[PDB]
Amino acid sequence: DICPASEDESGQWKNFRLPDFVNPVHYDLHVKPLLEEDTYTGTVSISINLSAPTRYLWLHLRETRITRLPELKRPSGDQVQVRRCFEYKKQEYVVVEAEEELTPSSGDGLYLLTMEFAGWLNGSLVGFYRTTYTENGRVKSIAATDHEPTDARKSFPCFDEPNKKATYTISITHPKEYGALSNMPVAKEESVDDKWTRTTFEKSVPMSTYLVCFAVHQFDSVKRISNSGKPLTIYVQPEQKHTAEYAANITKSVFDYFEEYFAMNYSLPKLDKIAIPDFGTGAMENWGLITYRETNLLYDPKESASSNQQRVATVVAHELVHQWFGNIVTMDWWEDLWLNEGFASFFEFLGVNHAETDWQMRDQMLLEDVLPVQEDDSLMSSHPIIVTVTTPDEITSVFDGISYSKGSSILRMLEDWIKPENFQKGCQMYLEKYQFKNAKTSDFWAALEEASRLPVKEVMDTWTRQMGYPVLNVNGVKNITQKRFLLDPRANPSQPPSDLGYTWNIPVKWTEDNITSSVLFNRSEKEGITLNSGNAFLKINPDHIGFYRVNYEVATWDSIATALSLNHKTFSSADRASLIDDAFALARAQLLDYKVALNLTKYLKREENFLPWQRVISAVTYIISMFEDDKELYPMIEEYFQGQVKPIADSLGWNDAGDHVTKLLRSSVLGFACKMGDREALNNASSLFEQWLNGTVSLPVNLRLLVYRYGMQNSGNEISWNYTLEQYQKTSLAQEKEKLLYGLASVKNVTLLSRYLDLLKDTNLIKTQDVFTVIRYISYNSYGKNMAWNWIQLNWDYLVNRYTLNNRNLGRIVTIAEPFNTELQLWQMESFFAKYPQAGAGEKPREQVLETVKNNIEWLKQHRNTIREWFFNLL
Ligand SMILES: *[C@@H]1O[C@H](CO)[C@@H](O[C@@H]2O[C@H](CO)[C@@H](O[C@@H]3O[C@H](CO)[C@@H](O)[C@H](O)[C@H]3NC(C)=O)[C@H](O)[C@H]2NC(C)=O)[C@H](O)[C@H]1NC(C)=O
Ligand SMILES: *[C@@H]1O[C@H](CO)[C@@H](O[C@@H]2O[C@H](CO)[C@@H](O[C@@H]3O[C@H](CO)[C@@H](O)[C@H](O)[C@H]3NC(C)=O)[C@H](O)[C@H]2NC(C)=O)[C@H](O)[C@H]1NC(C)=O
Ligand SMILES: *[C@@H]1O[C@H](CO)[C@@H](O[C@@H]2O[C@H](CO)[C@@H](O)[C@H](O)[C@H]2NC(C)=O)[C@H](O)[C@H]1NC(C)=O
Ligand SMILES: *[C@@H]1O[C@H](CO)[C@@H](O[C@@H]2O[C@H](CO)[C@@H](O)[C@H](O)[C@H]2NC(C)=O)[C@H](O)[C@H]1NC(C)=O
Ligand SMILES: *[C@@H]1O[C@H](CO)[C@@H](O[C@@H]2O[C@H](CO)[C@@H](O)[C@H](O)[C@H]2NC(C)=O)[C@H](O)[C@H]1NC(C)=O
Ligand SMILES: *[C@@H]1O[C@H](CO)[C@@H](O[C@@H]2O[C@H](CO)[C@@H](O)[C@H](O)[C@H]2NC(C)=O)[C@H](O)[C@H]1NC(C)=O
Ligand SMILES: *[C@@H]1O[C@H](CO)[C@@H](O)[C@H](O)[C@H]1NC(C)=O
Ligand SMILES: *[C@@H]1O[C@H](CO)[C@@H](O)[C@H](O)[C@H]1NC(C)=O
Ligand SMILES: NC(=[NH2+])NCCC[C@H](N)C(=O)O
Ligand SMILES: [Zn+2]
**CATH number, residue 585:** 1.25.50.20
According to DSSP, the β-strands at 437-439 and 329-331 are parallel
Q: For 654, what's the count of Cα atoms within 13 Å in the CB-facing half-sphere?
A: 19
Note whether 712 and 720 are within 8 A (CB): yes
- Regarding whether 729 and 671 lie in a shared domain, the answer is yes
Residues with CB under 6 A from ligand 8: 475-476, 478-479, 530
Question: What burial letters (b/e) apply to 411-439, b meaning 16+ CB within 10 Å?
Answer: bbbbbbbbeeebbbbbbbebbeebeeebb
Helix (H) or strand (E) holding 461: none
Note whether 183 and 212 are within 8 A (CB): yes
Q: Which domain holds residue 568?
A: 553-875
**Phi/psi at 694 (nearest 5 deg)?**
-70, -10
Radius of gyration of the chain (CA): 28
Q: Rounded to an integer, what distance in angstroms lies between the CA atom of residue 833 and that of residue 852? A: 15
Give 278 Cα–ligand 10 centroid separation in angstroms: 19
Give Cα separations from 364 to 265, 487, 509 (angstroms): 29, 24, 20
Q: For 148, what's the count of Cα atoms within 13 Å in the CB-facing half-sphere?
A: 23
CB atoms within 10 A of CB 493: 14
Give 425 Cα–ligand 2 centroid separation in angstroms: 55
CA-based nearest residue to 418, from 457, 386, 385: 457
CA diameter of the chain: 90
* Ligand nearest the Cα atom of residue 841: 9
Angular region, 338: left φ>0, alpha ψ -120 to 50, beta rest: alpha
- Regarding whether 870 and 739 lie in a shared domain, the answer is yes
Ligand 7: atom nearest CA of 227 is 5
**Active site positions, annotated:** 319
CA 531 to chain centre: 37
Note whether 167 and 76 are within 8 A (CB): no
Question: What burial letters (b/e) apply to 84-114, b meaning 16+ CB within 10 Å?
Answer: ebbbbeebbbbbbbbeeebeebeeeebbbbe
Note whether 703 and 670 are within 8 A (CB): yes
Please report, for the chain, how many H helices and E strands are present, in that order.
Answer: 29, 30
Indicate the residue type of 97. Answer: E
CA-based nearest residue to 159, from 24, 275, 28, 258: 24
SS (H, E, C) 810-869: HHHHHHHHCCCCCHHHHHHHHHHHHHCCCCHHHHHHHHHHHHHHHHHHHHHHHHHHHHHH
Q: Which residues are annotated as a binding site for substrate?
A: 148, 282-286, 808
- Regarding whether 357 and 237 lie in a shared domain, the answer is yes
- Regarding whether 627 and 517 lie in a shared domain, the answer is no
- Collapsing DSSP to helix, strand or coil, 202 comes out as coil
**Phi/psi at 130 (nearest 5 deg)?**
-120, 145
Give 294 Cα–ligand 10 centroid separation in angstroms: 17
Angular region, 528: left φ>0, alpha ψ -120 to 50, beta rest: left
CB atoms within 10 A of CB 475: 11
**Phi/psi at 96 (nearest 5 deg)?**
-115, 130
CB atoms within 10 A of CB 563: 14
Kindly state if the Cβ of 475 falls inside 6 Å of ligand 5: no
> What stretches of 745-795 show up as alpha helix (H) in DSSP?
750-759, 771-780, 784-794
For this experimental structure, what is the resolution in angstroms? 2.2
Q: Pocket of ligand 7, candidates 259, 264, 265: which has the most ligand atoms within 8 Å of its Cβ, to mutate?
A: 265
Residues with CB under 6 A from ligand 1: 650, 680, 683-684, 687
Q: Which residues are annotated as a binding site for Zn(2+)?
A: 318, 322, 341
Q: Which residue has the CA at smallest separation from atom 12 of ligand 8? A: 476
Q: Which residues are annotated as a binding site?
A: 148, 282-286, 318, 322, 341, 808
Indicate the residue type of 644. Answer: Q
Q: Rounded to an integer, what distance in angstroms lies between the CA atom of residue 322 and that of residue 208? A: 13
Q: Which letter does DSSP use for residue 370 in this model?
A: I
CA angle 381/382/386 to nearest 5° reads 135
- Collapsing DSSP to helix, strand or coil, 411 comes out as helix
Q: Rounded to an integer, what distance in angstroms lies between the CA atom of residue 759 and that of residue 774? A: 10
According to DSSP, the β-strands at 470-475 and 437-439 are unpaired
According to DSSP, the β-strands at 271-275 and 231-236 are parallel
Give 122 Cα–ligand 3 centroid separation in angstroms: 9
Note whether 463 and 410 are within 8 A (CB): yes
Note whether 456 and 449 are within 8 A (CB): yes
Cα dihedral 230/236/238/241 (nearest 10): -70
Q: Rounded to an integer, what distance in angstroms lies between the CA atom of residue 148 and that of residue 832? A: 30
Last residue of one domain, picked from the residues 219, 254, 288: 219
**Axis-axis angle for helices 784-794, 771-780 (nearest 10):** 140
SS (H, E, C) 544-592: HCCCCEEECCHHHHHHHHHHHHHHHHHCCHHHHHHHHHHHHHHHHCCCC
Kindly state if the Cβ of 655 falls inside 6 Å of ligand 5: no
Q: Rounded to an integer, what distance in angstroms lies between the CA atom of residue 23 and that of residue 42? A: 22
Q: Rounded to an integer, what distance in angstroms lies between the CA atom of residue 13 and that of residue 7? A: 11
Last residue of one domain, picked from the residues 431, 450, 468: 468
CA-based nearest residue to 548, from 457, 485, 464: 485
Q: Which residues have C-beta within 8 Å of that of residue 56, sequence separation ≥ 6? A: 11, 12, 13, 95, 96, 97, 98
Q: Which residues have C-beta within 8 Å of that of residue 801, sequence separation ≥ 6? A: none
- DSSP per position, 10-28: SSGGGSSSPPTTEEEEEEE
- Regarding whether 600 and 543 lie in a shared domain, the answer is no
**Phi/psi at 620 (nearest 5 deg)?**
-70, -40
Kindly state if the Cβ of 299 falls inside 6 Å of ligand 4: no
- Regarding whether 391 and 486 lie in a shared domain, the answer is no
Ligand 5: atom nearest CA of 752 is 2
Indicate the residue type of 55. Answer: R
Kindly state if the Cβ of 651 falls inside 6 Å of ligand 5: no
Q: Which residue has the CA at smallest separation from atom 21 of ligand 5? A: 751
- Regarding whether 871 and 792 lie in a shared domain, the answer is yes
Q: After which residues is the chain broken (C to N over 2.5 A)?
A: 532
The total number of structural domains that make up the chain: 4
Give Cα separations from 444 to 121, 143, 419 (angstroms): 40, 37, 16
Q: Rounded to an integer, what distance in angstroms lies between the CA atom of residue 96 and that of residue 102? A: 13
Q: Pocket of ligand 5, candidates 721, 746, 749, 750: which has the most ligand atoms within 8 Å of its Cβ, to mutate?
A: 749
* Ligand nearest the Cα atom of residue 309: 4
Ligand 7: atom nearest CA of 265 is 1
**Axis-axis angle for helices 734-744, 771-780 (nearest 10):** 40
Q: Which residues have C-beta within 8 Å of that of residue 633, sequence separation ≥ 6? A: 627, 864, 867, 868, 871
SS (H, E, C) 82-149: EEEEEEEHHHCEEEEEEEEEECCCCCCCCEEEEEEEEEECCCCCCEEEEEEEEECCEEEEEEEEECCC
- Regarding whether 252 and 210 lie in a shared domain, the answer is no
Helix (H) or strand (E) holding 445: helix 441-452
Q: Pocket of ligand 3, candidates 35, 122, 763: which has the most ligand atoms within 8 Å of its Cβ, to mutate?
A: 122
- Regarding whether 711 and 656 lie in a shared domain, the answer is yes
SS (H, E, C) 655-696: CCCCCHHHHHHHHHHHHHHHHCCCHHHHHHHHHHHHHHHCCC
- Regarding whether 863 and 726 lie in a shared domain, the answer is yes
Q: How was this structure determined?
A: X-ray
Give Cα separations from 354 to 207, 234, 254, 856 (angstroms): 29, 21, 7, 41
CB atoms within 10 A of CB 28: 15
Q: Rounded to an integer, what distance in angstroms lies between the CA atom of residue 539 and that of residue 477? A: 10
Say how many Å lie between the first and final Cα of the chain, rounded. Answer: 75
* Ligand nearest the Cα atom of residue 531: 8
Note whether 226 and 255 are within 8 A (CB): yes
Ligand 7: atom nearest CA of 229 is 5
Q: Which residues have C-beta within 8 Å of that of residue 717, sequence separation ≥ 6? A: 747, 749
Q: Pocket of ligand 9, candidates 399, 769, 813: which has the most ligand atoms within 8 Å of its Cβ, to mutate?
A: 399
Note whether 347 and 258 are within 8 A (CB): yes
Give 751 Cα–ligand 5 centroid separation in angstroms: 8
CB atoms within 10 A of CB 690: 14
Q: Which residues have C-beta within 8 Å of that of residue 855, sequence separation ≥ 6? A: 487, 488
Give Cα separations from 689 to 108, 231, 755 (angstroms): 70, 44, 22
Assign residue 195 the CATH number of its domain.
2.60.40.1730
Q: Rounded to an integer, what distance in angstroms lies between the CA atom of residue 320 and that of residue 317? A: 5
- Regarding whether 490 and 428 lie in a shared domain, the answer is no
Give 447 Cα–ligand 7 centroid separation in angstroms: 23
CA-based nearest residue to 165, from 203, 209, 201, 110: 209
Q: Which residues have C-beta within 8 Å of that of residue 654, sequence separation ≥ 6? A: 670, 684, 688, 700, 703
Q: Which residue has the CA at smallest separation from atom 9 of ligand 1? A: 680
Last residue of one domain, picked from the residues 552, 585, 608: 552
Note whether 98 and 82 are within 8 A (CB): yes
Assign residue 354 the CATH number of its domain.
1.10.390.10
CA 62 to chain centre: 25
Q: Which residues have C-beta within 8 Å of that of residue 736, sequence separation ≥ 6? A: 300, 303, 304, 704
**Axis-axis angle for helices 634-652, 610-626 (nearest 10):** 160
* Ligand nearest the Cα atom of residue 473: 8
Note whether 158 and 28 are within 8 A (CB): no
Q: Rounded to an integer, what distance in angstroms lies between the CA atom of residue 92 and that of residue 3? A: 13
Q: Which residues have C-beta within 8 Å of that of residue 834, sequence separation ≥ 6? A: none
Q: Which residues have C-beta within 8 Å of that of residue 197, sequence separation ≥ 6? A: 173, 174, 175, 176, 178, 180, 189, 190, 191
- Collapsing DSSP to helix, strand or coil, 440 comes out as coil
Give 788 Cα–ligand 5 centroid separation in angstroms: 21
- Regarding whether 718 and 598 lie in a shared domain, the answer is yes
